[PDB]
Amino acid sequence: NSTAELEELLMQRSLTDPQLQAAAAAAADFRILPDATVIKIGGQSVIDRGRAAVYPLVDEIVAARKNHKLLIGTGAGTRARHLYSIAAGLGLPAGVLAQLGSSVADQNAAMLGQLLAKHGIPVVGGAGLSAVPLSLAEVNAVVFSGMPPYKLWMRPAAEGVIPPYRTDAGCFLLAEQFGCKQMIFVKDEDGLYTANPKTSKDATFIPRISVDEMKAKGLHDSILEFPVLDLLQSAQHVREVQVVNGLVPGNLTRALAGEHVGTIITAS
Amino acid sequence: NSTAELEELLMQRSLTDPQLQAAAAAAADFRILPDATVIKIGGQSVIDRGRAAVYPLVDEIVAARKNHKLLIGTGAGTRARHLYSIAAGLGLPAGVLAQLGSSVADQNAAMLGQLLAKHGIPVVGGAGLSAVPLSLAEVNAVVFSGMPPYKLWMRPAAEGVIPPYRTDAGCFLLAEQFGCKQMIFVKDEDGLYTANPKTSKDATFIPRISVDEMKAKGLHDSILEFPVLDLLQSAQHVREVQVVNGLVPGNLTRALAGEHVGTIITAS
Amino acid sequence: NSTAELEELLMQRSLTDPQLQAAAAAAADFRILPDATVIKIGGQSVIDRGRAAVYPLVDEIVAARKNHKLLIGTGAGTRARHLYSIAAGLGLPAGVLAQLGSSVADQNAAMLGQLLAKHGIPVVGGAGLSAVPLSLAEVNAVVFSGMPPYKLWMRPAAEGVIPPYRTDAGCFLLAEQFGCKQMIFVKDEDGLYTANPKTSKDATFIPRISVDEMKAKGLHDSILEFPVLDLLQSAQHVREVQVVNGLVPGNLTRALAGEHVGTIITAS
Amino acid sequence: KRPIRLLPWLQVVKIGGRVMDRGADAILPLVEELRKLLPEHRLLILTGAGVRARHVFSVGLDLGLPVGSLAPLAASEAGQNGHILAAMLASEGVSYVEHPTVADQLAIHLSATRAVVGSAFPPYHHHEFPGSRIPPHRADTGAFLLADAFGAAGLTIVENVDGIYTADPNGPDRGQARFLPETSATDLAKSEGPLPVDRALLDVMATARHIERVQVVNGLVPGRLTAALRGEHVGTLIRTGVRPA
Amino acid sequence: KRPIRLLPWLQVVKIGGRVMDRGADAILPLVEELRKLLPEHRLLILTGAGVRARHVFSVGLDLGLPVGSLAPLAASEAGQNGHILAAMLASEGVSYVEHPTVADQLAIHLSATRAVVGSAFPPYHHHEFPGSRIPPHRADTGAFLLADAFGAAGLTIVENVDGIYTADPNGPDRGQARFLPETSATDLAKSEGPLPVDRALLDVMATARHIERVQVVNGLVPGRLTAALRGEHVGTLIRTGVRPA
Amino acid sequence: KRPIRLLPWLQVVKIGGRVMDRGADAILPLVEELRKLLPEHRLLILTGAGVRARHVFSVGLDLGLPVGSLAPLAASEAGQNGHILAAMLASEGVSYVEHPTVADQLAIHLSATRAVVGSAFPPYHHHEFPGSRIPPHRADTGAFLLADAFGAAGLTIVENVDGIYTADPNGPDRGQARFLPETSATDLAKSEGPLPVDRALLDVMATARHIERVQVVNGLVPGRLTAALRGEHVGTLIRTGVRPA
Ligand SMILES: Nc1ncnc2c1ncn2[C@@H]1O[C@H](COP(=O)(O)OP(=O)(O)OP(=O)(O)O)[C@@H](O)[C@H]1O
Ligand SMILES: Nc1ncnc2c1ncn2[C@@H]1O[C@H](COP(=O)(O)OP(=O)(O)OP(=O)(O)O)[C@@H](O)[C@H]1O
Ligand SMILES: Nc1ncnc2c1ncn2[C@@H]1O[C@H](COP(=O)(O)OP(=O)(O)OP(=O)(O)O)[C@@H](O)[C@H]1O
Ligand SMILES: Nc1ncnc2c1ncn2[C@@H]1O[C@H](COP(=O)(O)OP(=O)(O)OP(=O)(O)O)[C@@H](O)[C@H]1O
Ligand SMILES: Nc1ncnc2c1ncn2[C@@H]1O[C@H](COP(=O)(O)OP(=O)(O)OP(=O)(O)O)[C@@H](O)[C@H]1O
Ligand SMILES: Nc1ncnc2c1ncn2[C@@H]1O[C@H](COP(=O)(O)OP(=O)(O)OP(=O)(O)O)[C@@H](O)[C@H]1O
Ligand SMILES: [Mg+2]
Ligand SMILES: [Mg+2]
Ligand SMILES: [Mg+2]
Ligand SMILES: [Mo]
Ligand SMILES: [Mo]
Ligand SMILES: [Mo]
Ligand SMILES: [Mo]
Ligand SMILES: [Mo]
Ligand SMILES: [Mo]
Ligand SMILES: [Mo]
Ligand SMILES: [Mo]
Ligand SMILES: [Mo]
Ligand SMILES: [Mo]
Ligand SMILES: [Mo]
Ligand SMILES: [Mo]
Ligand SMILES: [Mo]
Ligand SMILES: [Mo]
Ligand SMILES: [Mo]
Ligand SMILES: [Mo]
Ligand SMILES: [Mo]
Ligand SMILES: [Mo]
Ligand SMILES: [Mo]
Ligand SMILES: [Mo]
Ligand SMILES: [Mo]
Ligand SMILES: [Mo]
Ligand SMILES: [Mo]
Ligand SMILES: [Mo]
Ligand SMILES: [Mo]
Ligand SMILES: [Mo]
Ligand SMILES: [Mo]
Ligand SMILES: [Mo]
Ligand SMILES: [Mo]
Ligand SMILES: [Mo]
Ligand SMILES: [Mo]
Ligand SMILES: [Mo]
Ligand SMILES: [Mo]
Ligand SMILES: [Mo]
Ligand SMILES: [Mo]
Ligand SMILES: [Mo]
Ligand SMILES: [Mo]
Ligand SMILES: [Mo]
Ligand SMILES: [Mo]
Ligand SMILES: [Mo]
Ligand SMILES: [Mo]
Ligand SMILES: [Mo]
Ligand SMILES: [Mo]
Ligand SMILES: [Mo]
Ligand SMILES: [Mo]
Ligand SMILES: [Mo]
Ligand SMILES: [Mo]
Ligand SMILES: [Mo]
Ligand SMILES: [Mo]
Ligand SMILES: [Mo]
Ligand SMILES: [Mo]
Ligand SMILES: [Mo]
Ligand SMILES: [Mo]
Ligand SMILES: [Mo]
Ligand SMILES: [Mo]
Ligand SMILES: [Mo]
Ligand SMILES: [Mo]
């Protein structure tokens, strides 16, 4: 392998050529924001619950940014489920639903950002390259809206019109693209169980599991979007994720400190 | 009152229902930028006068931001009066005039911002949520254009087509929305008088007055836009305003220090 | 001369009137960003060369911003030459080519900005008035795309359809407009020679030369866009420029320290 | 004189967010009715917000947010309803257009195509007026401000009820609710109970320059919108107080 | 070969800011003339800045601001004049369009409607050329750069005077001012006195590829614009130096 | 049921970036063919990226940049090709439109004019999927996602070769390359060699709801695009697996 070999292949073959694909894979790997952690604040699981859930997390974020650089993405939640129900009932396709869901993640980012503004933490577009706020001890964090950009170009699921890449995928891919050190999903359960804990009384807690193991037990579409598990297996930079309960005081803070709260889901 | 009572009303009634309106009024009251002061720099009264008026105020702003967080809005002035005269003479409605006036406040914000740029103070859109600049000792201030966003949706006055909500109202409402601690209008007279001091030789200075008292003496449309006095009476957060002469050296600085220069106009 | 004389002329004459033009020339001269240096990083000469050229310059920029405020503009390079060849062959005019070249300078700004993001240095639009980043020791530099804004309104050259104002002119005019203290073009040769050093074996190095002298020797369109030399002669603020080799380690750093590396080209 | 009419040939139609909330059962017949109206009128169709704005108010009020924060959050739900409605009309050449496009380029867009859809909320945003914790300038109000500023030929409000009653026809006192075929903005302004239209609508009617009447009709009954756009009396007429020059 | 014409069927009309400054007395007859021209031509109407730009120059120069600061501030006044003119033509399907729309989507917009209005200033902005403290690339120049880049069928400049004279016909030496029915850009370029057109216009004429002549006509006399758009000689013709292939 | 078709009367045409790279010799005949198609079809013309994206990949990979960085950099080259093609069609009323305009306002734009041009790349950007260092969702894929989401009447891919062969017809093993008049996405998906279409195209074909077939034709042979838009078999047909309801 050489630049020369790569540049020659890049000029002379289709991008679909295996020989080109292989030469590209040997390229150097730059991490753009290696010291940042991406956190997703759930829409239905946290922000829709209002002050009792949101205020303690705002306090944790303010405290945590003293020691940790954070990119904080928002989920969507019940208003997006309502838009999806109306639009699916009209026969609209996944790409149209995708656009509708973005608006709800943006509302949630605005609400969280307004609670954080006096603390110096902005809502931004372009979180991964928010170079200035992330370089300042006075700031050290930004808020972003967690939907991906695909919108009308969203790939549909194999069945139905609900967009399969939503705010879990949006936040995950930002962590992956920017080469961040850690990805934490903040939800309303302690982590992953052997079945949905809201519905099953004797579900058993799982502290640590691989994607293959989850699939083998049918946990593909439980506490995370199933397509995220597949993105995770293909990821170059973020090869595990942690799922924690944001309703437990200090849980986010503890996860940022390296405590093994919640569930760790590994690519392999 | 309860969340539950409120959420039930919000789902089951029109927003026009008195019972819903009352339940909403009992909600908590978050101040987004409580430590900031909003200042309006007059268009006709200050910026149109050029260097002799503007340069000393730029120096005061630079000095003041060491101790005080500032949102500095611009007025419009003679070029907006010219656009209003041309457009009113064509029979155009208030909503079209409103858009024209915004451009002039923006010109003035650009000019002021260029004098402040080397001092680290930016012109921004979204001043109230300009979290980053307002959290930095090196900055601690922003400039914004003072017109409100209503544009074609401007409510007209009872008579004529001049937009009734202009840069005094724009700046005031930003102070009110963001829960700022203080609103100072910087003009070219010492404060409010019993009649227009430019026209009446024996007008008497008024250090302090309520909106009701102003109305009773016919000072509704004197040194402030009259609709601002009505907004002030309805305000949740900013219940008084101070009007000062920006042509007097150090007057703005003194007002920020708590000196009772100029006139204080109270909601009640 | 007086404001009064100027304001009267400005109201009563055409802007083409010599008497008005002369009165305007007597106006005060404010420098907006006097402590900044504008640097152009060449497209073909540097960024197109990849890691071996770019990585050491990224390190120099990171180190240099500790002591020097920088506005770093990008060139375009081989992809713009390709677009110009395709579009010129179709008979498209200079204004259409101008728009195409901008996209390539923007790609290059994105690539450089991604390498700088973890160091706190943003890619911006509006570099000259990037008040916040330029006021912070943690930042002190921004990256911008070096094409001018003219686009479809580009004035063509006397012959052919290649836009005559490209990234050398874009960066130069930003330095001039903002009253910056220094303009450094970073290319792939040590400076100006008596002939193109890539083509002539015995070209002689020129440490210092005026624009008139360059013209008299036929160096009008050698290492800088020829129209830049003419802009330089008309400039109010930046009356000389320095051309340096960015492929020599530390050369940019040395130029910022006042070392007379490369060539200094003077307006007079 | 009163200001000139900018778009005298325009008809403005505001569709209630609560009509859109009913989903396909309400939306499909409305869409078929609008399709048949495209050759007859030059339409600006503006959507309100409906129940999702009540949810964002619930969250935002629980977080303590001021009325200027809540205004754009509600407006977003009206914009989403507009994107839904426009998608259903896309095959007829209809798209959603943004507020700046409505404000500055409506004439070219209604030359390009027969109707466009936009959000009925006005861009008051963080400059919403204080006093109530609920944003006062909502969809009915935004739609009226536009129709009147343009000097449009009409504004028709399409609701989930027959028109205005003396009490909420779906509420506690619904047995004493009597239908009002005709009313004036001033008479409505002096009553205290709930209405199917923003109270701010009555205020902008008082300062109006062109629109003399606004009809509120039931969009759940096919043909009422079509009748109202021809001036037929099929719901509640609200007289604004404006008179001919 | 010279570059191709992009929009060979386009007519470009630049309206002086000082014509707009005269208000309704000048604007209403101009609007009625433009209305009657809509079925005859495909028009890009571009407005200049006029007296408000002189005021912003007065303030900006007093604050010491450089020429690149003054350029966008003047341009804003040309944009406002364009919004005013477009509002008067809204009922005919005409709207103001922004510079990026002019530069990239004019063809679709002139398919949608018969004319659009834009700002005549070019987006030189902070990259305005240095030398003079007054921005050189102003409305006449911007309009010509566009008309020539598009390869338009013409550019007509609508002024508050009959055309170009040997001295300012409203100035100190107005008694010796003689009317020039025809002139060339090169002859004008070598004179020193004031003109009713930007001096930079003469420079962009020298590098022009398509437009062979530009007529300056009095917009205060009804019918001169209509005549000029038919090639009739009713003001001053300026020969650019371009010749047919 | 499957989702409704939004724009059932639309034809989508993707023009390969490598066709545009051939310059005037390829572009001028293509432009003349497209001009003649304007009265026949309602066209969304989408351009791919071609060789300049290979250069930006070379630089970006040498700088170590991740796949999400490379995606928008390649997309830019497809946008530039679209601006070039649109300029050549400007005199026919055709302009380039941006992605948000394609996504939300295509219906009004195709009411205003007969065709518009856009970038074929989808806005995956920094959220491009990881795995390969080369962005997987490229121009063929973006064009198909749009055509299928709109429920368009077709998508035709205009290439610099006759269609799909069993090996690269311009590569090392070109002597054993055999032409495939017809194939299915599933059969293609299981092969390993290079193709003239994105591999991701085959994946989005598997989840497609409307488009049943996509034809790949040689844009260097005049008349093949015109024939393909009439359903004539002149290149390689790719069956997506979608069947009629
Ligand atoms: N096996 C499982 N273990 C744990 N939680 C599960 C499991 N299966 C399902 N869940 C449920 O998934 C929910 C998380 O999904 P939810 O959509 O609430 O998250 P979110 O991040 O809030 O999404 P959005 O942010 O877009 O609303 C949990 O509340 C939990 O009830
Ligand atoms: N009773 C009064 N007391 C004091 N000042 C008064 C009174 N009545 C009228 N004024 C006048 O109102 C003027 C302030 O209005 P003006 O429009 O100049 O302020 P501005 O903030 O400069 O507005 P804009 O900023 O949009 O130009 C003062 O110059 C003063 O002459
Ligand atoms: N007399 C000369 N002295 C020095 N260099 C010269 C001379 N004449 C021509 N050059 C050439 O000009 C080149 C610089 O132009 P080039 O376009 O590479 O710069 P750039 O800043 O990289 O442009 P862009 O950034 O848009 O690619 C040098 O590589 C050098 O070969
Ligand atoms: N006096 C009244 N007459 C008729 N309806 C009333 C009255 N008072 C309250 N209502 C209620 O108003 C409801 C209409 O709700 P509302 O006006 O909030 O919805 P909308 O107009 O669809 O929403 P949006 O304002 O977001 O577009 C009716 O169903 C009825 O229950
Ligand atoms: N040689 C000349 N011939 C004719 N008019 C002249 C000449 N010299 C100066 N002028 C003046 O130019 C004036 C026109 O002013 P000017 O060209 O600035 O306005 P405009 O073109 O309307 O403005 P803008 O350039 O902003 O559109 C005429 O009224 C006349 O007084
Ligand atoms: N199996 C195959 N059948 C046909 N062409 C092939 C095959 N494998 C590789 N190719 C090559 O694909 C080339 C087309 O290149 P490619 O698909 O990258 O360009 P494009 O579609 O114009 O670019 P873009 O995807 O940016 O629009 C053909 O010229 C051919 O050499
Ligand atoms: Mg209602
Ligand atoms: Mg003139
Ligand atoms: Mg291909
Ligand atoms: Mo958006
Ligand atoms: Mo957005
Ligand atoms: Mo916001
Ligand atoms: Mo925001
Ligand atoms: Mo930002
Ligand atoms: Mo920004
Ligand atoms: Mo945005
Ligand atoms: Mo966005
Ligand atoms: Mo955006
Ligand atoms: Mo970005
Ligand atoms: Mo961005
Ligand atoms: Mo930022
Ligand atoms: Mo920034
Ligand atoms: Mo604006
Ligand atoms: Mo703006
Ligand atoms: Mo600015
Ligand atoms: Mo600015
Ligand atoms: Mo900003
Ligand atoms: Mo921003
Ligand atoms: Mo803006
Ligand atoms: Mo704006
Ligand atoms: Mo904006
Ligand atoms: Mo904002
Ligand atoms: Mo904003
Ligand atoms: Mo900011
Ligand atoms: Mo910033
Ligand atoms: Mo920011
Ligand atoms: Mo751009
Ligand atoms: Mo851009
Ligand atoms: Mo970027
Ligand atoms: Mo960026
Ligand atoms: Mo920025
Ligand atoms: Mo920004
Ligand atoms: Mo920013
Ligand atoms: Mo931009
Ligand atoms: Mo831009
Ligand atoms: Mo822009
Ligand atoms: Mo700016
Ligand atoms: Mo900007
Ligand atoms: Mo910035
Ligand atoms: Mo900023
Ligand atoms: Mo837009
Ligand atoms: Mo827009
Ligand atoms: Mo705007
Ligand atoms: Mo826009
Ligand atoms: Mo804007
Ligand atoms: Mo726009
Ligand atoms: Mo735009
Ligand atoms: Mo732009
Ligand atoms: Mo735009
Ligand atoms: Mo842009
Ligand atoms: Mo745009
Ligand atoms: Mo746009
Ligand atoms: Mo967007
Ligand atoms: Mo836009
Ligand atoms: Mo946006
Ligand atoms: Mo736009």
PDB file of N, CA and C in Angstrom, chain F residues 96-127:
ATOM      1  N   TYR F  96     -30.714  25.191 -11.314  1.00  0.00           N
ATOM      2  CA  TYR F  96     -30.357  24.324 -10.212  1.00  0.00           C
ATOM      3  C   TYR F  96     -31.186  24.695  -8.998  1.00  0.00           C
ATOM      4  N   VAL F  97     -31.649  23.695  -8.251  1.00  0.00           N
ATOM      5  CA  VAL F  97     -32.357  23.943  -6.976  1.00  0.00           C
ATOM      6  C   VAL F  97     -31.657  23.182  -5.875  1.00  0.00           C
ATOM      7  N   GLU F  98     -31.659  23.768  -4.689  1.00  0.00           N
ATOM      8  CA  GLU F  98     -30.959  23.168  -3.546  1.00  0.00           C
ATOM      9  C   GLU F  98     -31.689  21.988  -2.922  1.00  0.00           C
ATOM     10  N   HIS F  99     -30.994  21.171  -2.138  1.00  0.00           N
ATOM     11  CA  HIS F  99     -31.615  20.006  -1.532  1.00  0.00           C
ATOM     12  C   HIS F  99     -32.908  20.303  -0.740  1.00  0.00           C
ATOM     13  N   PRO F 100     -32.943  21.365   0.091  1.00  0.00           N
ATOM     14  CA  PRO F 100     -34.212  21.570   0.806  1.00  0.00           C
ATOM     15  C   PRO F 100     -35.369  21.879  -0.117  1.00  0.00           C
ATOM     16  N   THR F 101     -35.064  22.572  -1.213  1.00  0.00           N
ATOM     17  CA  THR F 101     -36.076  22.880  -2.241  1.00  0.00           C
ATOM     18  C   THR F 101     -36.541  21.612  -2.939  1.00  0.00           C
ATOM     19  N   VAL F 102     -35.612  20.706  -3.242  1.00  0.00           N
ATOM     20  CA  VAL F 102     -35.984  19.425  -3.815  1.00  0.00           C
ATOM     21  C   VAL F 102     -36.868  18.675  -2.842  1.00  0.00           C
ATOM     22  N   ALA F 103     -36.489  18.702  -1.579  1.00  0.00           N
ATOM     23  CA  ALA F 103     -37.208  17.867  -0.623  1.00  0.00           C
ATOM     24  C   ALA F 103     -38.586  18.393  -0.277  1.00  0.00           C
ATOM     25  N   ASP F 104     -38.771  19.710  -0.260  1.00  0.00           N
ATOM     26  CA  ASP F 104     -40.042  20.273   0.181  1.00  0.00           C
ATOM     27  C   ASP F 104     -40.858  21.022  -0.849  1.00  0.00           C
ATOM     28  N   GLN F 105     -40.226  21.476  -1.933  1.00  0.00           N
ATOM     29  CA  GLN F 105     -40.932  22.339  -2.887  1.00  0.00           C
ATOM     30  C   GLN F 105     -40.780  21.921  -4.310  1.00  0.00           C
ATOM     31  N   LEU F 106     -40.509  20.649  -4.538  1.00  0.00           N
ATOM     32  CA  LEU F 106     -40.359  20.260  -5.920  1.00  0.00           C
ATOM     33  C   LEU F 106     -41.638  20.492  -6.731  1.00  0.00           C
ATOM     34  N   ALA F 107     -42.807  20.247  -6.125  1.00  0.00           N
ATOM     35  CA  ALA F 107     -44.077  20.354  -6.844  1.00  0.00           C
ATOM     36  C   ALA F 107     -44.257  21.776  -7.381  1.00  0.00           C
ATOM     37  N   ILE F 108     -43.992  22.813  -6.564  1.00  0.00           N
ATOM     38  CA  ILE F 108     -44.164  24.156  -7.077  1.00  0.00           C
ATOM     39  C   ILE F 108     -43.132  24.461  -8.162  1.00  0.00           C
ATOM     40  N   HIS F 109     -41.894  24.006  -7.977  1.00  0.00           N
ATOM     41  CA  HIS F 109     -40.876  24.305  -8.979  1.00  0.00           C
ATOM     42  C   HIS F 109     -41.168  23.636 -10.325  1.00  0.00           C
ATOM     43  N   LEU F 110     -41.744  22.430 -10.331  1.00  0.00           N
ATOM     44  CA  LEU F 110     -42.075  21.782 -11.588  1.00  0.00           C
ATOM     45  C   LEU F 110     -43.405  22.266 -12.132  1.00  0.00           C
ATOM     46  N   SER F 111     -44.133  23.085 -11.379  1.00  0.00           N
ATOM     47  CA  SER F 111     -45.270  23.856 -11.899  1.00  0.00           C
ATOM     48  C   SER F 111     -44.748  25.123 -12.564  1.00  0.00           C
ATOM     49  N   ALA F 112     -43.686  25.718 -12.003  1.00  0.00           N
ATOM     50  CA  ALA F 112     -43.101  26.967 -12.541  1.00  0.00           C
ATOM     51  C   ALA F 112     -42.400  26.714 -13.874  1.00  0.00           C
ATOM     52  N   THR F 113     -41.740  25.563 -13.989  1.00  0.00           N
ATOM     53  CA  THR F 113     -40.902  25.290 -15.149  1.00  0.00           C
ATOM     54  C   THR F 113     -40.890  23.799 -15.489  1.00  0.00           C
ATOM     55  N   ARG F 114     -40.345  23.424 -16.648  1.00  0.00           N
ATOM     56  CA  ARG F 114     -40.450  22.042 -17.099  1.00  0.00           C
ATOM     57  C   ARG F 114     -39.461  21.079 -16.452  1.00  0.00           C
ATOM     58  N   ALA F 115     -38.285  21.563 -16.062  1.00  0.00           N
ATOM     59  CA  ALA F 115     -37.281  20.688 -15.436  1.00  0.00           C
ATOM     60  C   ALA F 115     -36.471  21.527 -14.496  1.00  0.00           C
ATOM     61  N   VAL F 116     -35.944  20.868 -13.470  1.00  0.00           N
ATOM     62  CA  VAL F 116     -34.923  21.487 -12.622  1.00  0.00           C
ATOM     63  C   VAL F 116     -33.780  20.525 -12.440  1.00  0.00           C
ATOM     64  N   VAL F 117     -32.630  21.072 -12.053  1.00  0.00           N
ATOM     65  CA  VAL F 117     -31.434  20.260 -11.825  1.00  0.00           C
ATOM     66  C   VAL F 117     -31.080  20.312 -10.348  1.00  0.00           C
ATOM     67  N   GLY F 118     -30.598  19.213  -9.779  1.00  0.00           N
ATOM     68  CA  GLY F 118     -30.161  19.211  -8.375  1.00  0.00           C
ATOM     69  C   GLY F 118     -28.989  18.286  -8.243  1.00  0.00           C
ATOM     70  N   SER F 119     -28.376  18.262  -7.071  1.00  0.00           N
ATOM     71  CA  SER F 119     -27.312  17.300  -6.790  1.00  0.00           C
ATOM     72  C   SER F 119     -27.900  15.926  -6.487  1.00  0.00           C
ATOM     73  N   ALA F 120     -27.355  14.860  -7.092  1.00  0.00           N
ATOM     74  CA  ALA F 120     -27.806  13.498  -6.822  1.00  0.00           C
ATOM     75  C   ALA F 120     -27.324  12.970  -5.477  1.00  0.00           C
ATOM     76  N   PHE F 121     -26.288  13.569  -4.888  1.00  0.00           N
ATOM     77  CA  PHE F 121     -25.880  13.039  -3.595  1.00  0.00           C
ATOM     78  C   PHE F 121     -26.944  13.306  -2.537  1.00  0.00           C
ATOM     79  N   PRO F 122     -27.135  12.343  -1.619  1.00  0.00           N
ATOM     80  CA  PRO F 122     -28.088  12.558  -0.532  1.00  0.00           C
ATOM     81  C   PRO F 122     -27.360  13.281   0.600  1.00  0.00           C
ATOM     82  N   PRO F 123     -28.084  14.030   1.435  1.00  0.00           N
ATOM     83  CA  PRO F 123     -27.447  14.786   2.544  1.00  0.00           C
ATOM     84  C   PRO F 123     -27.195  13.867   3.755  1.00  0.00           C
ATOM     85  N   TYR F 124     -26.372  12.831   3.583  1.00  0.00           N
ATOM     86  CA  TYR F 124     -25.942  11.997   4.723  1.00  0.00           C
ATOM     87  C   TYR F 124     -24.837  12.665   5.521  1.00  0.00           C
ATOM     88  N   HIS F 125     -23.905  13.290   4.799  1.00  0.00           N
ATOM     89  CA  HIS F 125     -22.947  14.198   5.401  1.00  0.00           C
ATOM     90  C   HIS F 125     -22.161  13.572   6.523  1.00  0.00           C
ATOM     91  N   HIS F 126     -22.068  14.247   7.679  1.00  0.00           N
ATOM     92  CA  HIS F 126     -21.260  13.717   8.762  1.00  0.00           C
ATOM     93  C   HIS F 126     -21.913  12.530   9.434  1.00  0.00           C
ATOM     94  N   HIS F 127     -23.179  12.273   9.103  1.00  0.00           N
ATOM     95  CA  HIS F 127     -23.889  11.088   9.553  1.00  0.00           C
ATOM     96  C   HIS F 127     -23.862   9.960   8.532  1.00  0.00           C
TER      97      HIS F 127
END
